[PDB]
């Protein structure tokens, strides 16, 4: 595993992401739900604290929530159960 460092939309590499879940569809739904969670954490920050938490990893200067979710995925910071 000696790939050159990725950049932009391909960070983290999807092949290392796929080892965490079964298929890429599971990755899609994983990251979508987690990014939604992060988004409404950002929305529900002004009022009282509720059950939502995150982002567990430190985001960038300005970073889209989905990128944060996928980076959290790659850092082994979540777990799940399918249907």
């Amino acid at each position: 595993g000696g790939y050159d460092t990725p950049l932009g939309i391909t960070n983290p590499p999807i092949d290392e992401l796929l080892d965490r879940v079964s298929s890429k569809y599971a990755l899609v739904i994983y990251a979508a739900k987690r990014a939604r969670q992060i988004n409404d954490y950002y929305n529900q920050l002004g009022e009282g604290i509720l059950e939502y938490v995150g982002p567990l990893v430190e985001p960038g200067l300005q970073e889209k929530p989905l990128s944060i979710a996928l980076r959290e995925i790659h850092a082994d910071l979540l777990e799940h159960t399918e249907g």
């Binding site: 938490v53 995150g54 567990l56 910071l77 777990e79």
Partner: peptide
Amino acid sequence: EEARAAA
């Protein structure tokens, strides 16, 4: 659980 405790 580990990172929820970390937070």
